[PDB]
Amino acid sequence: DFSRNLYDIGEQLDSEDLASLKFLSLDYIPQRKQEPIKDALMLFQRLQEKRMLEESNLSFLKELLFRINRLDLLITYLNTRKEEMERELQTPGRAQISAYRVMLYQISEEVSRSELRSFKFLLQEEISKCKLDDDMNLLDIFIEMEKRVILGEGKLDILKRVCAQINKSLLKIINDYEEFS
Amino acid sequence: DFSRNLYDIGEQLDSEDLASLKFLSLDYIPQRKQEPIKDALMLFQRLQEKRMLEESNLSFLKELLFRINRLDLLITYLNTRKEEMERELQTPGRAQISAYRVMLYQISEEVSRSELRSFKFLLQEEISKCKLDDDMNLLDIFIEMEKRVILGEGKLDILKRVCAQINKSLLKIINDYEEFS
Amino acid sequence: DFSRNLYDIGEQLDSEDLASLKFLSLDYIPQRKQEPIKDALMLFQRLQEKRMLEESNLSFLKELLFRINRLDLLITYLNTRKEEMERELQTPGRAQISAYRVMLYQISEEVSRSELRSFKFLLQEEISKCKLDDDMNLLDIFIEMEKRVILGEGKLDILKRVCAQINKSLLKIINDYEEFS
Amino acid sequence: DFSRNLYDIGEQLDSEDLASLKFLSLDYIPQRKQEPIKDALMLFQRLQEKRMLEESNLSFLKELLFRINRLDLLITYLNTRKEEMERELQTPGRAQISAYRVMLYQISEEVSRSELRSFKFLLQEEISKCKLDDDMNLLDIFIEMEKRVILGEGKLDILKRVCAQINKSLLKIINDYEEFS
Amino acid sequence: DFSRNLYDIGEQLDSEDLASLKFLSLDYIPQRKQEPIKDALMLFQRLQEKRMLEESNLSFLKELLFRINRLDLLITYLNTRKEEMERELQTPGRAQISAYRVMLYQISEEVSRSELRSFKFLLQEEISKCKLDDDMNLLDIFIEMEKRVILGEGKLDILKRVCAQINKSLLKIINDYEEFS
Amino acid sequence: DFSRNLYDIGEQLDSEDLASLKFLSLDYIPQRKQEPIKDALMLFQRLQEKRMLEESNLSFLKELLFRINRLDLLITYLNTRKEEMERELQTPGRAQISAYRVMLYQISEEVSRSELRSFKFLLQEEISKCKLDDDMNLLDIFIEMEKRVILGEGKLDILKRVCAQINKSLLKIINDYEEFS
Amino acid sequence: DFSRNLYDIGEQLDSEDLASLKFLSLDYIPQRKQEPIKDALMLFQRLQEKRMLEESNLSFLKELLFRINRLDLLITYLNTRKEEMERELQTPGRAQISAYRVMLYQISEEVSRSELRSFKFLLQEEISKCKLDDDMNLLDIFIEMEKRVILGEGKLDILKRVCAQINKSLLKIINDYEEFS
Amino acid sequence: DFSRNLYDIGEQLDSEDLASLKFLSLDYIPQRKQEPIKDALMLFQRLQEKRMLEESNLSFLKELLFRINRLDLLITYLNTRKEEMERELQTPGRAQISAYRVMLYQISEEVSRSELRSFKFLLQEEISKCKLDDDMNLLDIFIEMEKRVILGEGKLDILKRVCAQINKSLLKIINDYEEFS
Amino acid sequence: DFSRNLYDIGEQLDSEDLASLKFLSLDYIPQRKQEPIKDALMLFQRLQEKRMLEESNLSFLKELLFRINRLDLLITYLNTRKEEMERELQTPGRAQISAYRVMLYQISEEVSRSELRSFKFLLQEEISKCKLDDDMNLLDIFIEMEKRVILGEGKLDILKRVCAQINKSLLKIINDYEEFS
């Protein structure tokens, strides 16, 4: 019955937060399969097809909100505290979103608009293969980097070289991924 | 019908006031549902659809104008005196906007753009995830604080932990939490 | 004579108008007799066979045009004033189209495309038995609901729950049918 | 062969031009019989059946291009001076499209897309009978108003009540129509 | 081949001055066909439709470049001496941009940003439907005043109501209307 | 109408006198509404929005101008003597500016521009971490005291503990605390 | 069997990627057999029909995905690395499609949306037969030309008449047709 | 690759130096092309658009740094001595930035802000055609002079007249152009 | 949570102190990246982004206050004695700011505001490249000379040749530079 209230979660979702969910959902939803999604419920439909999100199991949604920092919804509508997802972080295999995706998202939160401009031209300096613009959310840029296979667990060094021209707080985020080695 | 007057109200409504009205609509319009609204008329349409703003019931708009201090509209268009605010504040349930939201507005009401920069210097301690713009409305920041569940009805007294460091006059509004009971 | 003139009058009607007329003809023309209809004249032929629409008695057509707000035809071709449609209220049973169908139609007039997509999700949330698509008109959905016996004067509460997820003006349209209790 | 060679005219005509031509063609082509038209060729076929556009008589097209301000084509392909389009004003009946239509057209050209949104609010101020959409051309709205018989050659000055609120110079365009009384 | 140099002119045209070209084109291209224009070359395409600007006749562009003081482009691309702009003064009707538009432009050139703010305050007193923001331009105000039908060729003197309060030199500019005596 | 003729005040109104008006308007115009005021026109705008400034009642403006002694110009706008401000003393609540704001202003008028230096030293004693910009006149300092809620209507007398060290004439100003009896 | 997975390549391919593949498949699949194609599987089936691409010989697909820079799919589905095509395509006759197609694609990667806008404006001046609109891809333009054999390898440098006014690095691409000698 | 270092060079560029580079780049970058440019690398992207600056040829930037006295970057990061830029004097055409532009730049380096005040007073004495503003950089004024063709290799006597009215030492720069007689 | 205690530093520090910090920060922050900074807390943000200043490592801030002679603040903010700064100086690699920068600062402290005038004359004798202004700090001038590469680690012994001419005791510091090499 709570699908009725899934609606009542999605309406509070920012267009930007949706794009964030799209990026994080890429571990399950194909790069094009995700594209028709225009809101949370569209995502939920895909996740129902993948059986990641359903009335019988909204634990994926629970994490998703934890990952994009929409804890207001986790508590308000899913009626649980963030510490539940922190318990899901306790042991391997309980987290549904990969740590690497989380780190890349954390970057997108750390990187400012001005720095994003640097990211745009700087990546172009790294390769002409990418066609970039001011509409390229860093997360969308990351998707493009995946296409060229210059973004991944074995390409982390590239991100660090990029960070050298941006800031060291990002470099930190990169080093903080060491524990998942 | 009466939307003939709403039009002429909206023409005189400021884009800054509209931003604050979006915050005030949070007790009815979903957190991010109002985000594609560009002018007063679109806002008014949503309120008509939710029947918060009716041709026979303009009392919600009346309050809204009281909340954004537009007395040039209260009398000019709604033909109501300023004293009617206290009339609507006679008993609980009469006001449509929570005193909680009213306080949050007044808290930001006394804030300077230079204090907003100072706030960001303190907000990075509260949550480094908060990617904020130098022209970010404090009310928008409050929405972000909801996301972190660090600002709320019972978490109102979190604000003073950094607001007292910026402008202790805000405390006079925060202490009005007593009007919850 | 004029029955033949209708040949060149029906072309002024939309395909959405036709679909709407099909919904309105649900109290006369069977679903299996509605589907073959491809244009207004096909509809007219069925109504001629059922003697609802004949040159000697076009009072059914007259009402229909009122029901779908095509008064331009009511006056310019059927040569009668829009004010004459009030005669439907002179006595119970005078109207050929039931108020119930009128209400459901008015809803489809009030519901936008974006809201329609929301209705698609909401019904999916209500049950998986109803398979839906992007070409589903709200009136088409109502037909599907009828077939599944979840649409009726005693099922209005379901529509009310769904409308609560959209807007209160739709709820109003439904509540306007309460006077026929 | 020649009229067939004019099939290419549609390659320099815009989709907006076609939409405008459809409105202007309403005096001869049924309100919705025009809709299958996807290009100028399709339009011409309807005009061939209506005998408005013939290989040996393009005077109808000549007027159209003048009315929609595609003078580049009026000269380049139809090889006629724009000055000779004013010959429609020499005696009554020389014009093929009613002055009523070009009046409404000029209005639609004068109104901004942002003002169209403003109109939408005032269109509900007029009535709830008109269902609105973001893709509605003001000419489309005019058609819808005709359907409700609240707009016409005798009801043109109904628009003035709303137009005064958007652009009062439209009132003059309307007032000038009086000269054809 | 100069239509390829129209591109060049457009690149060498100042994006800030393009706004004034739109103002100058008000009596040829409706604000609806102006607002989607992003550069001069797009405007030029509109002027091709009206046949104001073609390779066979760039005299309209010539006049436009005179108004926005781009004499360097008259020489560089139109290959003509600056004095040839004054050929429009030989006989009445030669000019295509009314001195009315020229004077209003000259006013906007004389008015300081600080004086504009003053005019915006005075507009708030003058126009009952005045709406102000940080993107306002005196030329845009003039357009809006036409929409209020308070500014015009015969109503030009209205500007002296506020110009006399600001800068006598602006009033002097207005007095140039005397040439229509 | 006439309101527009009060704009002239700005020509003779010193920016420092405007800053004084800002201090006096602290009980009316919000911080965020006050600080973007760059001239009397922006001030007037805010006053109109709260309908404090209206042709039917300019008494608030009058009182304000009396405080800064610019009501001397009243005889050039309303044609009446500034002495009629004494009417505010007839009964309690007639004055719109609290004697709290008045007394603090009188202090800023009594203290020498060079003596302010000593007040900066006093501020060092009270708060060695406080920023002491040379632009901080006593009125701005008083605002900073409000930011530290050390100064107010009930705290006003606190100033005497350092004012006695500056000049007994300042104590004489402070002795107007008797007006709160 | 395993082909089931290959079918899903299209679930990561974008519509832009597929459109690019269509352009690159112009040396195999006619424009009349490309239109029905809506996804990668459709493309695959067209190629399977004539054994041009089949599960037992994916060497053409290997290049295709390599050429459109989707190396993540070379890994994910083709279970290989870019190195394979880099080595394989070193010598003439190893490519399945003309480098002419590839080079034109590379241009579409280098040309910005903003550059394409002005690129199209030049196309209108360069070829009056063009039917330009917002849905035209740069590659679609090239096809439009081929529809009447007015663009191809024989005039591969024709684009220099447009690129010279846009971006010299596009001229560089043209100057990289050295191996076609 | 190395572009990465050009970025790193650019981070030490002043916004004034950037504007100066824009002026010097006016022999290449279109009048409005540089308007969205907010930092060095953005400019470099426009220089990549023209291929004035490229990893294959950095001599353009190298000269520019010499022109605006940023040898701290030329020597430090581009490993180039100023004498190698001075080596340009061997033969004509070695310089990519005209001595005309360099001369006018040097003037802006010689003229004080206080002399710009007196310049702008004399500018109005010369003509009211210039859209005078307090934020007008002398180089921006030069651009406006170019617009009106009152600045050039044959208009240098205008600046010479102005210089004689400001500072006799300025004449030592503007007269130096005589070497190209 | 430790940066919470940095807030009250920037409030105490002067704009001059900030300017001094900016000069000393040049070894890490680009010559023109710090310019938008309006207070010390904005500086701190940049330092934390570049991780030059960390909550776990405040030793850079510690040094900063030492270098600008604010040792008495170390006990008030970092709770450490000034003697520990000499402890740091005991061994190489502990200091984060170069002695070169520090010594140049000491010079600016020794040079009088009046002497600066005579230095401006000397700077003109040195070169016409450095544009001078009364609002320039000697440290700002130092930066400008560095830009011309006439001031540096190997040119420090050149500048002093005119420094002694104003204050011989400056060289009592400068000549000690030898000890660091």
Q: How far apart are CA I42 and CA B120, in angstroms?
A: 9
Chain breaks in chain G (C to N over 2.5 A) after: none
Q: How far, rounded to the nearest angstrom, does the alpha carbon of residue F89 sit from its chain's CA centroid? A: 18
Residue carrying structure tokens 């009125």: F139
Using an 8 Å Cβ cutoff, are B70 and B13 in contact?
yes
Nearest CA-CA partner of E4 in G122, G132, G130 = G122
Q: How far, rounded to the nearest angstrom, does the alpha carbon of residue G118 sit from its chain's CA centroid? A: 22
Handedness of CA C140, C141, C147, C150 (dihedral sign): negative
Interface test with I, best of A117, A160, A167 (most I CBs within 10 A): A167
Resolution to 1 decimal, in Å?
Answer: 4.6
Q: Encoding tokens for residue C54?
A: 């004949």
Nearest CA-CA partner of E177 in E92, E94, E96, E102 = E102
Q: How far apart are CA B108 and CA B24, in angstroms?
A: 13
- Provide DSSP, G12-78: TS-HHHHHHHHHHGGGTS-HHHHTT--SHHHHHHHHHHTTSSBTTB-HHHHHHHHHTT-HHHHHHTT
Q: How far apart are CA G51 and CA G57, in angstroms?
A: 9
Q: How many residues does chain I have?
A: 181
* Cα maximum dimension of chain F: 52
For CATH 1.10.533.10, the residue range(s) in chain H are: 3-90, 99-180
Interface test with C, best of B48, B49, B55, B57 (most C CBs within 10 A): B49
Interface test with D, best of C72, C74, C115, C138 (most D CBs within 10 A): C72
Three-state SS letters, D21-72: HHHHHCCCCCCCCCCCCCCHHHHHHHHHHCCCCECCECHHHHHHHHHCCCHH
Q: How far apart are CA B84 and CA B132, in angstroms?
A: 38
Residue I168 is which amino acid?
Answer: K
What one-character DSSP code corresponds to residue E170? Answer: H
CA geometry: angle at E110 spanning E104 and E113, to 5°?
A: 105
Nearest CA-CA partner of I26 in I147, I148, I161, I178 = I147
- Provide DSSP, D79-113: ---GGGGGGGGTSTT--SS-HHHHHHHHHHHHS-H
Which residues, 6+ apart, have CB-to-CB distance to B55 below 8 Å? Answer: B1, B2, B3
Direct distance between the N- and C-terminal alpha carbons of chain C, in angstroms, rounded to an integer: 43
Three-state SS letters, H67-134: HCCCHHHHCCCCCCCHHHHHHHHHCCCCCCCCHHHHHHHHHHHHCCHHHHHHHHHHHHHHCCCCCCCC
Q: Which residue of H has its CA nearest to G114?
A: H33
Residue carrying structure tokens 């490249």: I129
Q: How far apart are CA E104 and CA E96, in angstroms?
A: 15
Q: How far apart are CA I117 and CA C6, in angstroms?
A: 98
- Alpha-carbon dihedral H81, H82, H88, H93, rounded to 10 degrees: 100
CATH architecture of the domain formed by B100-180: Orthogonal Bundle (1.10)
Which residues, 6+ apart, have CB-to-CB distance to H53 below 8 Å? Answer: H6, H44, H47, H60, H61
Q: How far apart are CA B132 and CA B146, in angstroms?
A: 15
3-state class percentages of chain G: helix first, strand second, coil last, to nearest 5: 60, 0, 40
Q: How far apart are CA B24 and CA B21, in angstroms?
A: 5
**C-alpha R_g of chain A:** 17
The neighbours of chain C, by the rule of 3 or more Cβ pairs under 8 Å, are A, B, D
Give strand pairing partners of A57.
A54
Which residues, 6+ apart, have CB-to-CB distance to A68 below 8 Å? Answer: A17, A20, A21, A24, A105
Q: How far apart are CA D71 and CA E102, in angstroms?
A: 26
Which residues of chain E neighbour H147 with C-beta distances below 8 Å? 14, 69-72
Phi first, then psi, for residue D91 (nearest 5°) are: -130, 155
Q: How many residues does chain E have?
A: 181
For CATH 1.10.533.10, the residue range(s) in chain I are: 3-89, 99-180
Residue H152 is which amino acid?
Answer: G
For CATH 1.10.533.10, the residue range(s) in chain F are: 2-89, 99-180
CB atoms inside a 10 Å sphere around CB I155: 14
Nearest CA-CA partner of C76 in C8, C19, C14, C23 = C8
- The H or E element that residue G123 is part of is helix G113-126
What one-character DSSP code corresponds to residue C57? Answer: B
CB atoms inside a 10 Å sphere around CB B58: 20
- 3-class secondary structure, C54: strand
Which residues, 6+ apart, have CB-to-CB distance to B5 below 8 Å? Answer: B77
CA geometry: angle at H23 spanning H22 and H28, to 5°?
A: 75
Q: How far apart are CA F122 and CA E12, in angstroms?
A: 60
Using an 8 Å Cβ cutoff, are A110 and A29 in contact?
no
Residue C89 is which amino acid?
Answer: L
Q: How far apart are CA F136 and CA F146, in angstroms?
A: 14
Q: Encoding tokens for residue D53?
A: 């556009």
Chains A and C share 3 or more Cβ pairs within 8 Å: yes
Query: Do F130 and I12 lie within an 8 Å CB cutoff?
Result: yes
Q: How far apart are CA C131 and CA G150, in angstroms?
A: 49
- The H or E element that residue E64 is part of is helix E59-67
Nearest CA-CA partner of D130 in A139, C68, B25 = C68
Q: How far, rounded to the nearest angstrom, does the alpha carbon of residue A35 sit from its chain's CA centroid? A: 15
Q: How far apart are CA A71 and CA A80, in angstroms?
A: 9
Q: How far apart are CA G136 and CA G111, in angstroms?
A: 14
- No. of helices (H) and no. of strands (E), chain C: 11, 0
CB atoms inside a 10 Å sphere around CB H75: 16
Q: How far apart are CA H42 and CA A114, in angstroms?
A: 12
Residue carrying structure tokens 């490309």: G34
**C-alpha R_g of chain F:** 17
The CATH code of the domain at B3-96 is 1.10.533.10
Q: Encoding tokens for residue F107?
A: 């202090």
Residue carrying structure tokens 């002043």: H14
Chain breaks in chain C (C to N over 2.5 A) after: none
Q: Chain A residues contacting I, CB < 8 Å?
A: 167-169, 171-172
Q: Which CATH number fits domain G3-88: 3.40.630.30, 3.10.310.30, 1.10.533.10, 3.40.50.920?
A: 1.10.533.10
Q: How far apart are CA G62 and CA G78, in angstroms?
A: 7
Give the C-alpha distances (Å, rounded to integers) separating H2 from H5, H7, H8: 5, 9, 10
The CATH code of the domain at E5-89 is 1.10.533.10
For CATH 1.10.533.10, the residue range(s) in chain E are: 5-89, 99-180
Give the C-alpha distances (Å, rounded to integers) separating I40 from I7, I36, I44, I53, I136: 9, 11, 6, 12, 20
Residue carrying structure tokens 């097809």: A49
Give the C-alpha distances (Å, rounded to integers) separating H149 from H107, H130, H142, H144, I45: 19, 12, 10, 9, 48
Q: How far apart are CA B76 and CA B60, in angstroms?
A: 16
Q: Which residue of E has its CA nearest to D164?
A: E148
CATH architecture of the domain formed by H3-90: Orthogonal Bundle (1.10)
CB atoms inside a 10 Å sphere around CB I154: 9
What topology does CATH give the domain F99-180?
Death Domain, Fas (1.10.533)
Using an 8 Å Cβ cutoff, are I108 and I139 in contact?
yes
The CATH code of the domain at F2-89 is 1.10.533.10
Q: How far apart are CA G94 and CA A40, in angstroms?
A: 46
- Alpha-carbon dihedral A99, A100, A101, A102, rounded to 10 degrees: 50
For CATH 1.10.533.10, the residue range(s) in chain G are: 3-88, 99-180
Q: How far apart are CA G99 and CA G103, in angstroms?
A: 6
CB atoms inside a 10 Å sphere around CB E132: 15
Which residues of chain I neighbour A172 with C-beta distances below 8 Å? 51
How many Cα atoms within 13 Å fall on the side-chain side of residue F21? 30
Query: Do D109 and E51 lie within an 8 Å CB cutoff?
Result: no
Give the C-alpha distances (Å, rounded to integers) separating B59 from B23, B51, B96, E178: 18, 11, 9, 54
Which residues of chain E neighbour G117 with C-beta distances below 8 Å? 38
Query: Burial of D42 by CB count in 10 Å (0-12 exposed, 13-18 middle, 19+ buried)?
Result: middle
Which residues of chain H neighbour A122 with C-beta distances below 8 Å? 4, 7, 41
Q: How far apart are CA G124 and CA G141, in angstroms?
A: 11
- Alpha-carbon dihedral H155, H160, H163, H169, rounded to 10 degrees: 130
3-state class percentages of chain H: helix first, strand second, coil last, to nearest 5: 60, 0, 40
Q: Which CATH superfamily is domain I3-89 in?
A: Death Domain, Fas (1.10.533.10)
Q: How far, rounded to the nearest angstrom, does the alpha carbon of residue G19 sit from its chain's CA centroid? A: 8
Residue A63 is which amino acid?
Answer: E
Give the C-alpha distances (Å, rounded to integers) separating A55 from A78, B26, C34, C121, D161: 11, 27, 38, 14, 52
Interface test with B, best of E129, E135, E144, E148 (most B CBs within 10 A): E129
Q: Encoding tokens for residue C100?
A: 């119930």
Which residues, 6+ apart, have CB-to-CB distance to H21 below 8 Å? Answer: H13, H40, H43, H64, H68
Give the C-alpha distances (Å, rounded to integers) separating E12 from E74, E85, E90, G161, H23: 12, 19, 30, 19, 14
Residue I89 is which amino acid?
Answer: L
Which residues of chain A neighbour I48 with C-beta distances below 8 Å? 169
Which residues of chain H neighbour A165 with C-beta distances below 8 Å? 4, 7-8
Give strand pairing partners of E171.
none
Give the C-alpha distances (Å, rounded to integers) separating E88 from B73, E29, E64, E97, H129: 50, 21, 12, 10, 20
CB atoms inside a 10 Å sphere around CB C116: 16
Residue carrying structure tokens 């709604």: B78
Q: Which residue of B has its CA nearest to I1?
A: B125
How many Cα atoms within 13 Å fall on the side-chain side of residue B111? 29
Using an 8 Å Cβ cutoff, are F82 and F71 in contact?
yes
Residue B173 is which amino acid?
Answer: I
Nearest CA-CA partner of I43 in I67, I15, I18, I14 = I18
CB atoms inside a 10 Å sphere around CB H124: 11
CA geometry: angle at B107 spanning B104 and B108, to 5°?
A: 90
